Design a binder for this molecule. Sequence first.
Ligand SMILES: *[C@@H]1O[C@H](CO)[C@@H](O)[C@H](O)[C@H]1NC(C)=O
Lengths: 49, 43
Amino acid sequence: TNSTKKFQPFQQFGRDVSDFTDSVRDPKTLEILDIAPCSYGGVSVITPG
Amino acid sequence: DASAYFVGHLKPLTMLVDFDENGTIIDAIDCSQDPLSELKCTT
Ligand SMILES: *[C@@H]1O[C@H](CO)[C@@H](O)[C@H](O)[C@H]1NC(C)=O
């Protein structure tokens, strides 16, 4: 997804507290993006037996 | 005219750094200089 941050010319990657890379700069068109997994939320199955 | 320069030497130390929401370094505390900064390094 489109991001909002911007950093120095000598910086390419940014990481989270858990050292997960969440910000990447596209090398062709100089824009900043954001990554997030599409596995999210909790499910629960109810069975009568 | 007359000018002056200052020269210091580097030492191996342990640093505590903090960044703001733009990644700019705004403060730094070195340990081993006084007990309060040692407490801040520990905590
Ligand atoms: C961070 O960047 C924004 C946009 O350039 C700027 O307005 C702001 O003063 C900067 N600093 C902080 C502490 O938000």
